[PDB]
Amino acid sequence: SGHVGFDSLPDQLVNKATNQGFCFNILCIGETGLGKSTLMNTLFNTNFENEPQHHNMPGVKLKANTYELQESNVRLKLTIVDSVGFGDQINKEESFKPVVEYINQQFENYLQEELKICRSLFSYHDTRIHACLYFISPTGHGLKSLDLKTMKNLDNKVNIIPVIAKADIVSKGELHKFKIKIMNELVTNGVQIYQFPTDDETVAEVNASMNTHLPFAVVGSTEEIKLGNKMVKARQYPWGTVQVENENHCDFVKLREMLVRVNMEDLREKTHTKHYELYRRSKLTEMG
Amino acid sequence: FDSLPDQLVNKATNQGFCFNILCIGETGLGKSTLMNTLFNTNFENEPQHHNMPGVKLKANTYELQESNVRLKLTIVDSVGFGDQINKEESFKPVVEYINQQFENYLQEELKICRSLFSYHDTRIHACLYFISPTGHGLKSLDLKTMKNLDNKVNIIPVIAKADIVSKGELHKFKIKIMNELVTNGVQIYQFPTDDETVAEVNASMNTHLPFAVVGSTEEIKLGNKMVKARQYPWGTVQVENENHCDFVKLREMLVRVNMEDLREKTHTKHYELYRRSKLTEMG
Amino acid sequence: EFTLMVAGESGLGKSTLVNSLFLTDASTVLRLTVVDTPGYGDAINCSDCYKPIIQYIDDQFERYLHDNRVHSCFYFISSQGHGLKPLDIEFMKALHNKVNIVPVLSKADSLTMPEVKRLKRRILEEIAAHEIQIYQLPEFKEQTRCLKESIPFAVVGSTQMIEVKGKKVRGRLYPWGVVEVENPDHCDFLKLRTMLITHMQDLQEVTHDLHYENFRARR
Amino acid sequence: GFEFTLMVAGESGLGKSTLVNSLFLTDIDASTVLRLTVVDTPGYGDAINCSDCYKPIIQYIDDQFERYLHDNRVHSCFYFISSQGHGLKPLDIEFMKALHNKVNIVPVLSKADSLTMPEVKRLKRRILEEIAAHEIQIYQLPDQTRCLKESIPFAVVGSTQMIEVKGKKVRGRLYPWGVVEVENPDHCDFLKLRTMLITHMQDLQEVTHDLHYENFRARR
Amino acid sequence: YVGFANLPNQLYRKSVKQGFEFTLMVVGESGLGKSTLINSLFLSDLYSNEYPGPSLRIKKTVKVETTKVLIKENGVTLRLTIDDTPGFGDAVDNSNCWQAVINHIEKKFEDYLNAESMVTRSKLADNRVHCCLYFIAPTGHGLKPLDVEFMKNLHDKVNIIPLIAKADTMTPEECLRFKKQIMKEIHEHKIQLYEFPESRVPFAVVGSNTVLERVRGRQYPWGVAEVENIDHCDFTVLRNMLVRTHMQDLKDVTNNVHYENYRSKKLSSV
Amino acid sequence: YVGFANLPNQLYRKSVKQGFEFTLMVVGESGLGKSTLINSLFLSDLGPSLRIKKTVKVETTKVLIKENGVTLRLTIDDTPGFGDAVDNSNCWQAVINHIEKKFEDYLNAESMVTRSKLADNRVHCCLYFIAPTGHGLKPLDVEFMKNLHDKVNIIPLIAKADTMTPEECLRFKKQIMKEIHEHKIQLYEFPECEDEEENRLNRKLKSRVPFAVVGSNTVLEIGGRRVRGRQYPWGVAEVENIDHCDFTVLRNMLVRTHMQDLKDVTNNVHYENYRSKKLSSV
Ligand SMILES: Nc1nc2c(ncn2[C@@H]2O[C@H](COP(=O)(O)OP(=O)(O)OP(=O)(O)O)[C@@H](O)[C@H]2O)c(=O)[nH]1
Ligand SMILES: Nc1nc2c(ncn2[C@@H]2O[C@H](COP(=O)(O)OP(=O)(O)OP(=O)(O)O)[C@@H](O)[C@H]2O)c(=O)[nH]1
Ligand SMILES: Nc1nc2c(ncn2[C@@H]2O[C@H](COP(=O)(O)OP(=O)(O)O)[C@@H](O)[C@H]2O)c(=O)[nH]1
Ligand SMILES: Nc1nc2c(ncn2[C@@H]2O[C@H](COP(=O)(O)OP(=O)(O)O)[C@@H](O)[C@H]2O)c(=O)[nH]1
Ligand SMILES: Nc1nc2c(ncn2[C@@H]2O[C@H](COP(=O)(O)OP(=O)(O)O)[C@@H](O)[C@H]2O)c(=O)[nH]1
Ligand SMILES: Nc1nc2c(ncn2[C@@H]2O[C@H](COP(=O)(O)OP(=O)(O)O)[C@@H](O)[C@H]2O)c(=O)[nH]1
C-alpha cells in the first residue's frame, strides 16, 4: 500500500518448478485383463505396450516402467507400476503383499536419501507412488472380497480413485444401482478413498461436490472411430459403437479431470504431506 | 585571502603602540624644546637649575592620538649630565638605566606565568646624543660616553643649538666628528646601509650623521603660514627648514620611517647580546 | 429329463441367461433340472472352491448306481481375462473325467469379434495342451458340423422386456444400441439352445454309454 | 705707556682666541705683543676631570706676582660664560670664586648670538641674581652703568670677519639666515666693552696695582 | 490432452492460497539512509512515526531487532520480515561486531534444522534470513577494514548484497571508481559474493518518502532527486532483482548450499 | 601634525621580507573530503583524493603560497588513516603527540642561550569533519573534540553538506548545536570580549557553527555566469551563494577575518596554557 509490486512470487514458483521437471507415479492395480494397460494408453494418449501377461505367473509381482512426456512446455516423468500376476493365482491371501512392499520400499528410498549427510534433496528423484488406480470388475453384484482387502490394505499409503473397468457392459438403471451399491459398501466398510478438495473457492466446491458420482464408470481402448466429424475413441460392437469422450456413456472425462487436469498437484502434495509424513513419523518412531 | 595586514593593524589600533626616547647631553643644549617641537605637543618641562650634583633621569609618559593611532610615548631626559667637576663616572647612570630596562624585560620574558602581550616595552629604543657646538672636536667626556654606550643602545649623534655654528664651521665640526669616531672605532647607529633598494636612502642618512638641530615653540608669523621659529633681533630661524637646520631630517628618520627598525634592532641585536652575557654569567 | 448346471465364477450373469434360455441350489422346471451353481471364487482363497461340484456329481452317479445325471456341464469362462485362469484349468482338468463338459463364454456382449476369435483359439490351445477331453458333439449333419466349429459358444442373456424397433422382445437396452439376445448374429444364444434341444437324447445316451460307462470301468 | 697684560680663561670653543684677536685688532701661553701679554690658558675644561686646573692658573699668577715683588703682573682676567646654560655652571662659579681676589675679573657672556630679546633679558637677570646669591664681587665699573649692569655680564659676539652689509665692511658672523653685526649697539654690546676698556684702562691698572698687589704684598 | 499443462495453474492456486514468506536483513553504518530505502522498497510505512527506523531509535548494545508486515496485494499474501542491526560500527571499537549478525543467522538456520529433523513435522515456518543488504559508506576510497572483514566472515553463511548506500552524495565518476575498487578489494582477499543469476554488484540506492508534485523525490535547494530514473540510481535494479525477479532464487540458494554446508558441518560434528 | 600615524606602514613593510607562517591541521575520517576541501579553501592545487590507500604516520606538508606581496609558509597537517581502522580506541594520540612535539620544539628553541629568529612550528587552527549522518555526532567525533579542543583551535565542519534538504540541514545543525552545548564542547573560543562590534560579529558567527561546507575542484558555469560548485542530474550544488551552502562564511572566518586572530589565540592561550603546565613541571 503506497503502490504495487510482489505479484510475481507465484510466477517464480511456477518457473522454478517447471525448470526442475515434474514427476508422477501411478500404481495400476487390477485383475489381469481388466484394461489397465489399455486404460492408461487411453489416459495419456500414447502407446505404453507392456506385454499382455502370462496368466500362469508363479507369484504376484510388479512391473515398474518410467517414461517421459511433454505438453506445451511442461515435462513429466511417469512411473507406471502395474501389478502383474495380481488375482491370477489360486492363493490370493498374499496378492497385495508385493505392492505394499514396493510402496514402502520407495518411501524408504526417499527417507534414507533424506537423512544422508551429503544429501541432495533438491536434485534427487523421488520414486514414491502418487496416485493409485484401482480397477473394479464390472460384476454387477458389488465389489469382490479381494477388492475390499486391497483397498483397505492400501488406503493409507497412496491415493485411491475407484474406477469401474469395462464399464460399457452395464445398463444405466443397473449402472446407477451398482454405483450406489459401491458407494454404500465404501462408506459401510469405511474405505478412505481419495475425495475431491474442498478449500479452493474456485473449483473445490462446485466441481468437487458435483462429482459425488464416484466410482467412475470408464472404458478404454486404442482405436479411433468416426463419430459425427471426429475420430473419437470408442469400443466397437456388432450393434454399435460405445464412445468414451461423451459423458452420457461413460465417466472417463471426470476420471481425467482428476488425474491429469485439476487435482494432480493436490495428489502430489497429499502424497508428501498425508502419506509420506505418516510413514516417516512411524519409521522415525520405530528406529528411535 | 591574504588581507592579513588589515586585521593585523586593526588589532594593533585596538591596542596602540609604544615608543621610548632617551635624551642625553649637557644641560642647556636644548633637549626639551626640541622634544616639544618633535611631537608638537607642549610637555610641561619647567626651567630647571644646573645645581644638580649628579646625572639623574626624568621620565614622562604621554598618550598621543593621531588619526586612529594611540602612541604611548616615554621620553627620558638626562639632567645634570656633563656639568659637575668630576666628569669621569658620568657614563654609569645611563648604562645602568639601559641595563635595568633590559633586566626587567629579561625577567618578564623568563617568568614562568607570563603576562601575554601586556609587556609594556620600557626598553629605551632611541637615544639622542647632544654634542656641544664648539667648532674644534669631541670632548673627552663625549667620546668616552659615546664609545662606552654604542654597544648597548642605538646612539644618534646630534649637534645641539646648530644656530650658533656657521655652515663652513658646521661641516668642519662634522668632519672632525666622524674622523674621531672612526679613529676611536665607534659603530654609531647606522640606518640600514644595504637595505635592498632603501639602501641608498638609509646610507645617505648614515653619511649625514651627526645631525644639527634647532628647536622653537614660539609660533611666529612669517607669510600666511605661521611657523615654528626663533626670532632673534637680526633674523628669524625656521625649525622646519631644510636650508637652515637638519631638524626635519631627524624627525623624518626617528618618527616616519625608522621607529620599528629601532625597536627591532633593540630586540634582536642588543637585547639578545645582553641575554647571552647574562646566561653565560648565570651559571 | 435333463440336468442343466452352469458352472464358473460369480457375477457373470449366468442366472440371467438361464432364465432367458427357456423363456420362463437347483430347480426342476420335459423335466429340466436346472442347477444354478453358486459362483465360486468370491473368497480370497479358491483351493477348496472346486470341491463342492465333484461330490454332487459323484453322489449323483451314486444314487444312479444305487436320470439326475448332468447331461450338460455348462461352463462359463470369464470374458474379462486373456484366457483360462489356473482355477478354470484345474477345474476342467479335474471334472471332465465324470461329467460332460461344454464350454460357453459368459457376457459375450462385452467382447469384440476379433478378440472372441482370439480367445476361442487360445481356449482350444489350452484345452489341447492340457489334454482336456472336452465334449465333441457327434440338416442334422449341418448343425453337427457348425456346432463342432463353434466350440466354445458365446452367449448373451436377458430377462427384462423391451420395446426395441417395434415388437416386444427380450434383450438389453444400452445408449449405443439394443442387445438382441434372440438374434443369431449378435451372439450364439440360438446355437446353444438349438444344440441342447436337438441333442438332448444323444447327450443322455452318450452320458450313459461313455461318461457313465467308463465310470463303471473306473468304479 | 702702560704695558697691560691679559688673562683669558674658559672652556674650549667659547670663542676666546677670536675675541682677543678681534678686540685688539692683532693676532699656559703668555704671548707678548703699549705692551700686551695675552695669557691664554690652552688646557682647561676639555679634560676628563677638570678639578685641579684652577690651581695652576692660581699658581701662575702667584708666581707672576711674587716675581714682580722680587710690571709684568696679570691685571685683568676676562672670564667667558657659555651661552648654552640657564645660569652658571659649577666650573664657572668655582673658577670665579677662587680667582676673583688674585686677578680682577670681567664677566662676559660668550656667543650672545644664541639668545633672543626676552631670553637675553632673562639670562642676564639670572646671572645677576646668581652672582648676588653666591656673593660674587666682580670688578665694579666706575660711575650710565644702568644699561651696563643690565647687560653685565656683557653679552658679546666675536668674529674676525668683515662681512659686507649695506656696502660696508662690518664685523659679523654669517650663517645662512641673516648676518649678525658686532658694532650694532642694540644688544650686541661689544661696543660697550671696547669703549669702556679704552676709557678706563687707567682705572683698571690702578685698582689692580693698589688692591690686588697690596693684598698680595700683605699675603707675602 | 492428457492435460498436464494445467499443472502450473495448480501451482499458481496453491501458492496464492498458502501465501509467501520473505526475510530481509539490513546491515550497515547508521545514518546511511537505511530506513528510507526500506520504506521506499515496499512503498509502505513499515517504519512509521510511532515505530521509526534504527538510528531514529534503539542504538544501545549492537544487537539486532525485527519487524513483521503483512502485504495483501492482488490476492498475493506476503509475510515480510525486516531485520535491522541498529548500532553497528557506531562504536569506538568495532572488533568482532559481526557476532550478533552471525549468531542471528545461524539461530534461524538452527531453528529450521530442528524443525526439519523432528519426527512430527508441521508446516515449516521459513524464518531463515534470505537476503542481506550490506551498506557501504560512499567514502570513495575503498572497503573499510570493518566492511571487508565482515564480508570475509559472512560470505559462507548468507547471501550478501553490498550496497553503496548514500548515492546522491557521490558522483557517477567516483561511483564507478569506488565500484571498481570494491571489485578489486573483493578479489585479492578471496571474497565470494552472491553471483547473481539471470557486474552490477554493488548496486547504488537512493530513496525518498516525501511525495513532491506527484513523484517520490527529495527537494534539494537546487532541484529534485528522483529515484525511478535508471541512469541516476539502480534503486530500480535492486527493487526488480530482489522483489520481482529473484525473491525465490535467493530462498533456493539459501536452502541449497548455505543450509547443507551448515548441516554437513553440524551433523559430522555430532 | 607629527607622524605617529605612519607606524603601521613600517610594520607592513617589515612584514614583507620575513614572511608569515601558518600551520593548519585537518582532521577527520578518510574519504570525508579533507584534502579536497583544503584544495578548494586555499584556491590552490595542493590531489591526494586519488591516493586511494591507508597511511602510517602524521602527514605534514610544507608549501609557499604568495599573493599580493604576502608569503605564507604553510604546514598542512593531514592525519594518517584513523577512524577507518577497526580499533579506533586512542586514535587521537598521534595528533596529540604531534601537537606536543611542535610545542616542545618551539619552547626548547626559545629556552637556549643562543637564539635566532624562532622558526615557528606550532599548529594554529584545526578543522574537524563531521560525518553527514543527519541524526547526530558519532562517539568517535565527540571523544576527539573532547580530547583536542583544549590544545589547539578547533572548528567543526559538516562535510558533504550537499546531501541534505534544507529542513534536514536545519534539524541536523541544531541537533549538533544541542549536543555541543550538552557535552560542553567549547568550540573556537569567543567568551566575553568587552569590545562591542567585534563581540556581536563573533556571537553571530557562533550561532551558525557548525558550518555546512562543501569542497570540490570544479569550475561549472550556470546560465548567466561562471560559478564554483558540483553537478547532479537535477542541478548545480553551488558553493558561492549563501542560500545553497555556507562555505563563504567558513572561508571568511578561517582566512580573511580571523586568521591572525587564530594565531593570537594559539600563541597567547594554547601555547601559554601548555607552557604553565610544562614549565611548572620543570
Ligand atoms: N470392451 C472393452 N474392452 C477392453 C477395454 N479395455 C481393454 N479391453 C480389451 O482387453 C484387452 C486386454 O488388454 P488389457 O486388459 O489392458 O491388459 P492388462 O489387463 O491391462 O494387462 P497389462 O498389459 O499387463 O497392464 C485389450 O486388448 C482390449 O481389447 C474396455 O474398456 N472395454
Ligand atoms: N640658540 C639657540 N637656543 C635655543 C635653541 N633651542 C632652544 N633654545 C633655548 O635654549 C634654552 C634651553 O632650553 P631647554 O631645552 O629647556 O634646556 P635643557 O637643557 O633641556 O633644560 P630644561 O629647561 O630642564 O629642559 C631654552 O630656553 C630655549 O629658549 C636653539 O636651537 N638655538
Ligand atoms: N452385459 C451383460 N450383462 C449381463 C449379462 N447377463 C447378466 N447381465 C447383468 O448382470 C446383472 C446381474 O447378473 P446376474 O445374472 O445376477 O449374475 P449371476 O448371479 O452370476 O448369474 C444384471 O443386472 C444383468 O443385467 C450379459 O450377458 N451381458
Ligand atoms: N657664533 C659665534 N661663533 C664664534 C664666536 N667666537 C668664535 N666662534 C667660532 O668658533 C670657532 C673657533 O673658535 P675659537 O676662537 O677657537 O674658540 P676659543 O679659542 O675657545 O675662544 C670659529 O670658527 C668661530 O666661527 C662667537 O662669539 N659667536
Ligand atoms: N543523500 C541521501 N540521503 C538519504 C538517502 N536515503 C535517506 N537519506 C537521508 O538520510 C536521513 C536519515 O536516513 P534514515 O534513518 O533516516 O537513515 P538510516 O538510519 O540509515 O535508516 C533521512 O532524513 C534522509 O533524508 C540517500 O539515498 N541519499
Ligand atoms: N558530495 C561531495 N563530495 C565530495 C566533497 N568533497 C569531496 N568530495 C569527493 O569525495 C571524495 C573524498 O576524497 P578525499 O577528500 O581525498 O578524502 P580524504 O582526503 O581521505 O578525507 C573525493 O573523491 C571527492 O571528489 C563534497 O563537499 N561533497
Q: In what order do the strands lie in the sheet with B17-25?
A: B56-66, B69-79, B17-25, B126-131, B155-159, B211-212
Phi-psi map region of F33: left, alpha, beta (phi>0 left; psi -120 to 50 alpha): left
User: Is E217 labelled a binding residue?
Assistant: no
Question: H helices of F112-182, where?
Answer: 139-148, 166-182
Question: Using CB atoms within 10 A of its CB, is residue A224 exposed (0-12), middle (13-18) or buried (19+)?
Answer: exposed
CB E16 within 8 Å of CB E75: yes
With a 6 Å cutoff on the Cβ, whether A166 touches ligand 1 is yes
User: Cα(F226)–Cα(F238) distance, rounded to whole angstroms?
Assistant: 11
HEC sequence for E72-129:
EECCEEEEEEEEECCCCCCCCECCCCCHHHHHHHHHHHHHHHHHHHCCCCCCCCCCCC
Quote the cell numbers at residue E215. Answer: 513523484
User: Cα(C60)–Cα(C51) distance, rounded to whole angstroms?
Assistant: 14
* Amino acid residing at F221: E
Please name the residues in contact with B95: beta carbons below 8 A apart, sequence gap of 6 or more.
Answer: B148, B149, B152
Q: Centre a 10 Å sphere on the Cβ of residue B73 and count the other Cβ atoms it contains.
A: 21
Please name the residues in contact with E211: beta carbons below 8 A apart, sequence gap of 6 or more.
Answer: none
Q: Identify the sign of the CA torsion C209, C210, C216, C217.
A: positive
Q: Between the CA of residue F189 and those of A153, F208, F264, what are the distances in Å?
A: 95, 14, 12
Please name the residues in contact with A72: beta carbons below 8 A apart, sequence gap of 6 or more.
Answer: E5
> What burial letters (b/e) apply to E227-245, b meaning 16+ CB within 10 Å?
beeeebbbbebbbebbbbb
Residue whose C-alpha cell reads 534470513 in the numeric block: E129
User: Cα(E165)–Cα(E171) distance, rounded to whole angstroms?
Assistant: 13
E206-E208-E209 Cα angle (round to 5) = 155
Please name the residues in contact with C20: beta carbons below 8 A apart, sequence gap of 6 or more.
Answer: C157, C158, C159, C170, C181, C189
Residue whose C-alpha cell reads 510413514 in the numeric block: A279
Among the bound ligands, the one closest to the CA of E172: 6
Whether D113 and B232 lie within 8 Å, measured CB to CB: yes
Resolution (A): 3.3
Q: Centre a 10 Å sphere on the Cβ of residue F116 and count the other Cβ atoms it contains.
A: 9
Q: Centre a 10 Å sphere on the Cβ of residue A247 and count the other Cβ atoms it contains.
A: 10
Q: In what order do the strands lie in the sheet with B219-220?
A: B219-220, B227-232, B235-238
Question: Using CB atoms within 10 A of its CB, is residue D208 exposed (0-12), middle (13-18) or buried (19+)?
Answer: buried
- CA F23, distance to chain mean position in Å, is 10
Quote the cell numbers at residue B191. Answer: 640606518
User: Nearest residue CA, atom 5 of ligand 4?
Assistant: D15
**Coil, strand or helix: which one is B157?**
strand
- Tell whether D160 lies on the interface with B, counting CB pairs under 8 A: no
User: Is F49 labelled a binding residue?
Assistant: yes
User: Nearest residue CA, atom 13 of ligand 1?
Assistant: A35
> What burial letters (b/e) apply to E56-95, b meaning 16+ CB within 10 Å?
eebbeebebeeeeeebeeeebbbbbbbbbbbbbbbbeebe
Residue F84 with chain E: CB contacts under 8 Å: 144-145
> How many CB pairs lie under 8 A apart between chains E and F?
89
- Tell whether A43 lies on the interface with E, counting CB pairs under 8 A: yes
With a 6 Å cutoff on the Cβ, whether D126 touches ligand 4 is no
Residue whose C-alpha cell reads 685641579 in the numeric block: D52
* Amino acid residing at B79: V
HEC sequence for B215-259:
CCCCEECCCCCCEEEEEECCEEEECCCCCCCCHHHHHHHHHHHCC
With a 6 Å cutoff on the Cβ, whether D15 touches ligand 4 is yes
Whether C81 and A171 lie within 8 Å, measured CB to CB: no
> How many CB pairs lie under 8 A apart between chains B and D?
97
* Amino acid residing at B13: T
Q: Between the CA of residue C52 and those of C38, C48, C64, C75, C91, what are the distances in Å?
A: 10, 8, 19, 15, 11
With a 6 Å cutoff on the Cβ, whether F163 touches ligand 5 is yes
Phi/psi of residue A272, each to 5°? -75, -30
Atom from ligand 6 closest to the CA of residue F29: 21
Please name the residues in contact with B196: beta carbons below 8 A apart, sequence gap of 6 or more.
Answer: none
DSSP per-residue string spanning C71-115: SEEEEEE-SSSSS--HHHHHHHHHHTTTS-EEEEES-GGGS-HHH
Q: Find residue C154's DSSP bridge partners.
A: C105
**Coil, strand or helix: which one is C151?**
coil
Residue whose C-alpha cell reads 591574504 in the numeric block: B2
DSSP per-residue string spanning chain A: --S-----HHHHHHHHHHHH-EEEEEEEE--TTSSHHHHHHHTTTS--------TT-SS-EEEEEEEEEEETTEEEEEEEEEEESTTTSS--TTSSHHHHHHHHHHHHHHHHHHH-TT--TTT-------EEEEEE---SS---HHHHHHHHHHTTTSEEEEEETTGGGS-HHHHHHHHHHHHHHHHHHT--------S-TTTTTHHHHH---PSEE----S-EEEETTEEEEEEEETTEEEESSSTTT--HHHHHIIIIIISHHHHHHHIIIIIHHHHHHHHHHHH-
CB F51 within 8 Å of CB F81: no
Q: Identify the sign of the CA torsion E210, E213, E217, E223.
A: negative
User: Cα(E201)–Cα(E224) distance, rounded to whole angstroms?
Assistant: 26
Q: Find residue E69's DSSP bridge partners.
A: E80
- Kind of pairing between the strands at A216-217 and B219-220: unpaired
Q: Find residue B20's DSSP bridge partners.
A: B74
HEC sequence for E140-195:
CCCCCHHHHHHHHHHCCCCCEEEECCCCCCCCHHHHHHHHHHHHHHHHHCCCCCCC
Helices F139-148, F93-111: inter-axial angle, 10-degree rounding: 10
Q: Identify the sign of the CA torsion D136, D141, D143, D148.
A: negative
CB A25 within 8 Å of CB A57: no
User: Cα(F148)–Cα(F146) distance, rounded to whole angstroms?
Assistant: 6
User: Cα(E218)–Cα(E233) distance, rounded to whole angstroms?
Assistant: 13
Q: In what order do the strands lie in the sheet with D104-109?
A: D29-32, D37-40, D5-9, D76-81, D104-109, D154-155
Question: B29 CA distance to ligand 2 centroid (A)?
Answer: 6
- Tell whether A266 lies on the interface with E, counting CB pairs under 8 A: yes
Tell me F134's DSSP state. S
Q: Find residue B24's DSSP bridge partners.
A: B129
CB A221 within 8 Å of CB A235: yes
**Coil, strand or helix: which one is E42?**
helix
- CA A97, distance to chain mean position in Å, is 19
CB B52 within 8 Å of CB B80: yes
Tell me D7's DSSP state. E
Whether E2 and A69 lie within 8 Å, measured CB to CB: yes
Quote the cell numbers at residue B79. Answer: 639632567
Helices D54-69, D90-99: inter-axial angle, 10-degree rounding: 20
Residue C198: name the closest of C26, C64, C2, C23 by CA: C2
- Kind of pairing between the strands at F153-158 and F211-212: parallel
Residue C157: name the closest of C13, C23, C10, C27 by CA: C13
Within 13 Å of residue C53, how many CA atoms lie on the same side as its CB?
Answer: 25
Question: H helices of D41-199, where?
Answer: 54-69, 90-99, 117-131, 145-151, 190-199
**Coil, strand or helix: which one is F127?**
strand
Please name the residues in contact with B207: beta carbons below 8 A apart, sequence gap of 6 or more.
Answer: none
Atom from ligand 2 closest to the CA of residue D84: 10
User: Cα(A9)–Cα(F193) distance, rounded to whole angstroms?
Assistant: 70
Percent composition of chain F: helix, strand, coil (DSSP 3-state, to 5): 40, 20, 40
Q: In what order do the strands lie in the sheet with E131-135?
A: E65-73, E76-84, E20-27, E131-135, E160-163
* Amino acid residing at B4: L
Please name the residues in contact with E138: beta carbons below 8 A apart, sequence gap of 6 or more.
Answer: E164, E165, E166, E167, E169, E170, E178, F31
User: Cα(A66)–Cα(A23) distance, rounded to whole angstroms?
Assistant: 10
Residue F233 with chain E: CB contacts under 8 Å: 229, 231-232
* Amino acid residing at B41: T
Q: Find residue E22's DSSP bridge partners.
A: E80
- Tell whether F277 lies on the interface with B, counting CB pairs under 8 A: no
User: Cα(E29)–Cα(A159) distance, rounded to whole angstroms?
Assistant: 55
Q: Find residue C132's DSSP bridge partners.
A: none
Phi/psi of residue B92, each to 5°? -80, -50
Question: Using CB atoms within 10 A of its CB, is residue C17 exposed (0-12), middle (13-18) or buried (19+)?
Answer: buried
Q: Between the CA of residue B153 and those of B94, B124, B195, B262, what are the distances in Å?
A: 10, 7, 21, 10
Percent composition of chain D: helix, strand, coil (DSSP 3-state, to 5): 40, 15, 45
User: Cα(E214)–Cα(E224) distance, rounded to whole angstroms?
Assistant: 12
Tell me E49's DSSP state. S
Quote the cell numbers at residue B277. Answer: 652575557
Residue whose C-alpha cell reads 563563504 in the numeric block: F248
**Coil, strand or helix: which one is F103?**
helix
Within 13 Å of residue F240, how many CA atoms lie on the same side as its CB?
Answer: 13
User: Cα(D187)–Cα(D190) distance, rounded to whole angstroms?
Assistant: 9
Quote the cell numbers at residue F182. Answer: 550538552
User: Is B164 labelled a binding residue?
Assistant: yes
**Coil, strand or helix: which one is B56?**
strand
* Amino acid residing at B159: I
Q: Find residue B79's DSSP bridge partners.
A: B56
- Tell whether E45 lies on the interface with A, counting CB pairs under 8 A: yes
Phi-psi map region of A72: left, alpha, beta (phi>0 left; psi -120 to 50 alpha): left
User: Cα(F152)–Cα(F77) distance, rounded to whole angstroms?
Assistant: 13
CB E108 within 8 Å of CB E129: yes
Phi/psi of residue B135, each to 5°? 85, 0
Q: Identify the sign of the CA torsion D156, D159, D160, D164.
A: negative
Residue A236: name the closest of D69, D136, C113 by CA: C113
Question: B30 CA distance to ligand 2 centroid (A)?
Answer: 3
Please name the residues in contact with F260: beta carbons below 8 A apart, sequence gap of 6 or more.
Answer: B4, B7, B8, B11
CB E117 within 8 Å of CB E101: no
Peptide bond between residue E162 and the one before it cis (omega within 30 degrees of 0): no
**H or E segment and range at residue C122:** helix C113-129
Residue whose C-alpha cell reads 508363479 in the numeric block: A58
Residue E6: name the closest of A78, A253, A14 by CA: A14
DSSP per-residue string spanning D103-123: SEEEEEES-GGG--HHHHHHH
**Coil, strand or helix: which one is D20?**
helix
